[PDB]
Amino acid sequence: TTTADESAIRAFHRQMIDAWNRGSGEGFAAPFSETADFITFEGTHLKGRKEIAAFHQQAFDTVVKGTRLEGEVDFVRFVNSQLALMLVVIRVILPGQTETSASRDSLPLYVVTKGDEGWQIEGLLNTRKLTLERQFFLDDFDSLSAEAQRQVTDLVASLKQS
Amino acid sequence: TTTADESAIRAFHRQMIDAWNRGSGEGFAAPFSETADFITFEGTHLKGRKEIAAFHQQAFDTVVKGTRLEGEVDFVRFVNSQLALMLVVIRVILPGQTETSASRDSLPLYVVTKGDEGWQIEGLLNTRKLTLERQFFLDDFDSLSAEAQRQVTDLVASLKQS
Numbered sequence: 001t002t003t004a005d006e007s008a009i010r011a012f013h014r015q016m017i018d019a020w021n022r023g024s025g026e027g028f029a030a031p032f033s034e035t036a037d038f039i040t041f042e043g044t045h046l047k048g049r050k051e052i053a054a055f056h057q058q059a060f061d062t063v064v065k066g067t068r069l070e071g072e073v074d075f076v077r078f079v080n081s082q083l084a085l086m087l088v089v090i091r092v093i094l095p096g097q098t099e100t101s102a103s104r105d106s107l108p109l110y111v112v113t114k115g116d117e118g119w120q121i122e123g124l125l126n127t128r129k130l131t132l133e134r135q136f137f138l139d140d141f142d143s144l145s146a147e148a149q150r151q152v153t154d155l156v157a158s159l160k161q162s
Numbered sequence: 163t164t165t166a167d168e169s170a171i172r173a174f175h176r177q178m179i180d181a182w183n184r185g186s187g188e189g190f191a192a193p194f195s196e197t198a199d200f201i202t203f204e205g206t207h208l209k210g211r212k213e214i215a216a217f218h219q220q221a222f223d224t225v226v227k228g229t230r231l232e233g234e235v236d237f238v239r240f241v242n243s244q245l246a247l248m249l250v251v252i253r254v255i256l257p258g259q260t261e262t263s264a265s266r267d268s269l270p271l272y273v274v275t276k277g278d279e280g281w282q283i284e285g286l287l288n289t290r291k292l293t294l295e296r297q298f299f300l301d302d303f304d305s306l307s308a309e310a311q312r313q314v315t316d317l318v319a320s321l322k323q324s
């Protein structure tokens with residue numbers, strides 16, 4: 001394993017952050033292999049570079065238009081000379097905002113392989129990172145009756161008016 | 163690749179579910195290699211079978227005592243003859259309850275390698291799976307002022323009395 005190997009894997013996170021930020025689905029998908037599994041936070045499964053690009057272009061044009069990503073490496077480890085794991089911290093600023101929304105905090109795991117064509121992402125699980133405090137809040141919420149939950153969601157709706 | 167290979171990887175999810183359910187940290191850690199990365203939902207990093215076992219025994223004795231896991235395979239794919247990805251659905255019933263708490267819904271990704279010693283889990287990212295509806299609720303919450311958030315958390319606390 002080289003310094004070159006490690007630099008290539010790390011660069012994937014920057015390639016993606018920057019492509020998201022300029023709204024490029026193809027840029028975002030570029031590090032991925034043609035067979036890669038991409039799993040989104042709500043359990044959507046995208047299969048391969050092309051699907052990953054198509055899904056993200058559409059998203060950048062609609063449901064995350066105007067959002068901004070920021071992020072950095074949490075760890076990179078080589079399992080062997082042809083396989084690495086990389087965990088990355090990602091945060092999201094929603095449009096019109098200046099700060100990141102905790103609701104979007106993510107800690108994706110990248111599974112990177114060095115094949116015939118060199119390093120590519122073969123798997124990525126992108127999930128939400130919850131704080132313990134947010135976890136207990138959700139536990140509490142789910143423990144409430146549907147009627148009590150509705151009081152809570154109604155209060156949230158009335159406050160966002162408002 | 164064999165049927166045997168696939169059966170071995172799948173069995174890991176059952177080994178873990180059953181060990182959790184009988185409160186065995188060593189049982190839960192057994193499928194893992196001595197170098198494996200385990201990342202919990204709030205970003206805790208456990209390194210290797212022994213740490214994974216020590217952490218989980220302590221948890222089974224305290225903060226998740228009396229919880230029950232249920233789960234099933236979502237997909238298994240072989241990248242090559244020595245590397246597989248496996249996504250698993252996990253749900254949790256909190257003690258005293260008969261139903262699973264949505265707050266605990268998880269979709270872990272297992273990274274499995276076939277080394278000198280045969281199949282072992284080398285990486286696992288365990289995160290919370292959010293529905294789109296829960297995501298938008300959290301986005302709404304985080305968009306509120308701290309004072310509005312406090313009204314919401316106070317209401318939740320008053321309802322769980324109650």
Ligand SMILES: [Mg+2]
Pocket residue numbers: 142143144145146
């Ligand atoms: Mg209920």
Ligand SMILES: [Mg+2]
Pocket residue numbers: 304305306307308
């Ligand atoms: Mg604010």
